[PDB]
Structure 1
Amino acid sequence: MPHAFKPGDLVFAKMKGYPHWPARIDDIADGAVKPPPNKYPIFFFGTHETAFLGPKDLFPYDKCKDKYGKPNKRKGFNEGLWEIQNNPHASYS
């Protein structure tokens, strides 16, 4: 039965104007800016951008990869597909 989201969880994250995108729940570094209430720091694979999103925009990667994990023309998407499959927990600094 499902738990709350936690850092390291792999998702597809949906933003207005973008296809469901490979992403992870990031940690927050000591001294780093924290998200708003009920939001999580979402690191988008490929673009390496962070947004703060709530669960309504977060889909589990494993369950949804058949639907959402196909190549896309959007910039950074296919790089992101590689990252989430092959080294999703790496440092992308």
Structure 2
Amino acid sequence: MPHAFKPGDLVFAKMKGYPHWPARIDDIADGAVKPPPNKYPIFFFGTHETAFLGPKDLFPYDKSKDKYGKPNKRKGFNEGLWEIQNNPHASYS
């Protein structure tokens, strides 16, 4: 059975106006800004942007890739697909 989300989990993350996007749950570094309650730090592959999202917008990558893991015209998307498949836990700083 599923656990709660934890840092390192791979997802497609949904934001308004954008397709479901390859992403991961990030760690929060010591000294770094914490997310609001009930929110997770989401690092978006390809764009390398961070947003704070709740579970309603988080789709586990393995279950969802057949539906959401197809090339898309949007800036950063295809790079993001390579990242999540090939080095999802790397430093992208």
Q: Which TM-score band (shorter chain)? A: over 0.9
TM-score, scaled to structure 1: 1.00
Whole-angstrom distance in 1 between the partners of 2:83 and 2:42: 14
Structure 1 distance, partners of 2:59, 2:24, is 10
Tell me what 1:15 maps to: 15
Offset, 1:84: 0.1
Q: Secondary structure at the match of 2:23?
A: strand
CA deviations over 1:72-93 (Å, ceiling 9, x no partner): 0000000000000000000001
The SS at the match of 2:34 is: coil
> Could you tell me how far apart the structure 2 residues matched to 1:28 and 1:4 are?
17
Report how far residue 4 of structure 1 moved.
0.2
SS, match of residue 19 in structure 2: coil
Secondary structure, in 3 states, of the residue corresponding to 1:64?
helix
Q: CA deviation at 1:35?
A: 0.0
| Unmatched segments (≥5 aa) in structure 1 | none
3-state SS of paired residue (2:88)? coil
| SS at 1:29 equivalent | coil
Number of matched pairs: 93
Could you list the per-position Cα deviations for residues 25-78 of structure 1 after superposition, in whole angstroms to 9, with x for gaps in the alignment?
Answer: 000000000000000000000000000000000000000000000000000000
- Over aligned residues, Cα RMSD in angstroms? 0.2
| Partners of 1:12 and 1:44 in 2: CA distance | 9
In structure 1, how many angstroms separate the alpha carbons of the residues matched to 2:92 and 2:30? 17
Q: Take 1:25 and 1:43, find their aligned partners in 2: how far apart are those partners? A: 6
**Gap regions ≥5 residues in structure 2:** none
Q: TM-score, normalised by structure 2?
A: 1.00
Match of 2:49 in 1: 49
Kindly, what percent of the aligned residue pairs are identical? 99
